[PDB]
């Protein structure tokens, strides 16, 4: 059934599972035409497919050529997502294939279900969580590879850097959803806090700064303050 606050520790057990987020697959800018009508221009997108236990991120880059000559793109984008997730599962060794795929938006259920008919033992699940994965394009190392792509491409990342050497996957996922919720509510101020100390560097093979446990517990507090604020700045409280 659906994934929510009550069954949250299931994410960190030893059954392989993937989150699939389709938010950033079909991305457009909206602009005026010479005749004063409105048009869209697509830009490169990505499927965000994440193992929450290990941090492994399968970033399938969606090049704008895939939309050329196609109709009803928002609907096609969901089926293209499902086709690409299905191709990813088929490419994995059997012992690495997931036992569950959790989709962050309910409109992905039927497209994924139909594409995964060959895998009747893989559970396709929705969630009641409001997960902030759309904010993955705030990370310049991910945004940069998406925008630079000239053809369809899959790029593999570990979104937890080396954190699992020191913390659990529950704590790592909690930190990630805190970094991303902050980037999604106020991208600028979050970055200005995260990068406040220029002696704490983002290693070439990492996405986030080289924070020690003591800055990491702190900055999480700074990830907290920003989110409550913006929530006041929004609702006036």
């Amino acid at each position: 059934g659906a994934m929510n606050s009550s069954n949250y520790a299931e994410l960190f057990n030893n059954d392989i599972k993937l989150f699939v987020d389709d938010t950033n697959v079909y991305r457009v800018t909206v602009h005026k035409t010479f005749e004063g009508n409105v048009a869209t221009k697509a830009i490169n997108g990505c499927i965000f497919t994440l193992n929450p236990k290990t941090g492994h991120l399968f970033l399938k880059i969606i090049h704008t050529s895939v939309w050329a000559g196609q109709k009803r793109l928002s609907q096609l984008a969901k089926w293209k997502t499902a086709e690409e997730v299905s191709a990813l599962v088929r490419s994995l060794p059997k012992e690495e294939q997931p036992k569950q795929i959790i989709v962050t938006r309910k409109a992905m259920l039927d497209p994924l279900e139909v594409h995964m008919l060959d895998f009747p033992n893989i559970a396709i699940r929705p969630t009641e969580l409001r997960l902030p994965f759309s904010a993955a394009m705030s990370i310049d190392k991910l945004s940069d590879v998406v925008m630079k792509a000239t053809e369809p491409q899959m790029v593999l990342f570990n979104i937890y850097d080396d954190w699992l050497d020191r913390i659990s996957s529950y704590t790592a996922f909690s930190r990630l959803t805190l970094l991303l919720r902050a980037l999604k509510t106020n991208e600028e101020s979050a970055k200005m806090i995260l990068l406040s100390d220029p002696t704490i560097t983002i290693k070439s093979y990492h996405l986030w700064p080289s924070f020690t446990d003591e800055q990491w517990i702190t900055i999480e507090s700074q990830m907290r303050d920003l989110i409550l604020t913006e929530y006041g700045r929004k609702y006036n409280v």
Binding site: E83, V114, H115
Partner: protein, 300 residues
């Protein structure tokens, strides 16, 4: 015109014959139904006065044999049987007619309702959905489940309707996932019509039989089947024009005949609103849309 005699009526019961029904009191001198129109299947059905639980009944075609009803006090129901002695039967019927102990099938001459509801329904196809090959007639009741229902528990007593499932490999061609899910024409025309039913008449016959079992016995699995077969047509972009015209007629007479007080349980809102207002065939069911809108605007 043919006859189905009754040995007796030992328990109070409401007896239906097709869309007609009448009340019979305990040990009332009732000996059957005469003047049944030849050329159609028929259903004779029962609801006991004490136990409104379990409507049950028998599909038959008087061209296939001489049938009669006899109450069984051990199993507690009215059973259909075949009389193989033709002269015994004629003599039984002629005596009951002489004593005027039979109700007359009460068909009005202008009335084509029963023809319209059973146009494509054949006994031979009924007997393959309801497997009991030692009898020429078929028993159905409110509680019988369908083959597909059993996949999600006694097989001998199942309704073996054609399994339809829109999220299945049969329905979805590898590599046409989106195309086949959003436009079911492949599954309708190639898989079901050409492959399984062979022609649209057999498809419509199962659709009509499923509706009639839903209406007369409240058979829930039959209602599911009727709606699935409707939805498979309406969700196909490519349907022979003659099929769409006949479907509008078929559904029109089903909605016309449905008891007003049963629409809440027997009509699936999602299917009907999708079919009449969202589907490819939204503009192809004019008679059905008009009677639905004047008789069940609440559902829509």
């Amino acid at each position: 015109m043919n006859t189905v005699p009754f040995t007796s009526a030992p328990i109070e019961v409401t007896i239906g014959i097709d869309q007609y029904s009448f009340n019979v009191k305990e040990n009332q001198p009732f000996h059957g139904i005469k003047d049944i129109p030849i050329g159609h299947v028929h259903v004779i059905h029962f609801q006991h006065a004490d136990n409104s639980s379990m409507r049950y009944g028998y599909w038959f075609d008087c061209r296939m044999g001489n049938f009669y009803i006899q109450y069984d006090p051990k199993d507690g129901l009215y059973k259909m049987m075949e009389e193989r002695d033709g002269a015994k039967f004629e003599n039984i019927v002629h005596n009951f007619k002489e004593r005027q102990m039979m109700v007359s099938y009460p068909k009005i001459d202008e009335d084509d309702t029963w023809y319209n509801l059973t146009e494509f329904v054949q006994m031979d196809k009924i007997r393959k959905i309801v497997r009991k090959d030692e009898n020429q007639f078929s028993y159905v009741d409110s509680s019988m489940t369908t083959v597909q229902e059993n996949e999600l528990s006694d097989p001998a007593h199942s309704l073996n309707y054609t399994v339809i499932n829109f999220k299945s490999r049969e329905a979805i061609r590898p590599g046409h996932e989106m195309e086949d899910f959003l436009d079911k024409s492949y599954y309708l025309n190639t898989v079901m019509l050409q492959g399984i039913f062979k022609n649209s008449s057999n498809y419509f016959g199962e659709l009509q039989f499923a509706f009639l079992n839903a209406m007369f016995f409240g058979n829930y699995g039959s209602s599911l089947q009727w709606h699935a077969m409707i939805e498979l047509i309406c969700s196909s972009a490519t349907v022979p024009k003659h099929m769409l015209d006949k479907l509008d007629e078929i559904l029109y007479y089903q909605i016309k005949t449905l008891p007003e007080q049963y629409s809440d349980i027997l009509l699936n809102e999602r299917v009907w609103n999708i079919c009449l207002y969202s589907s490819f065939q939204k503009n192809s069911l004019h008679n059905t849309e008009k009677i639905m809108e004047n008789k069940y605007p609440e559902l829509l």
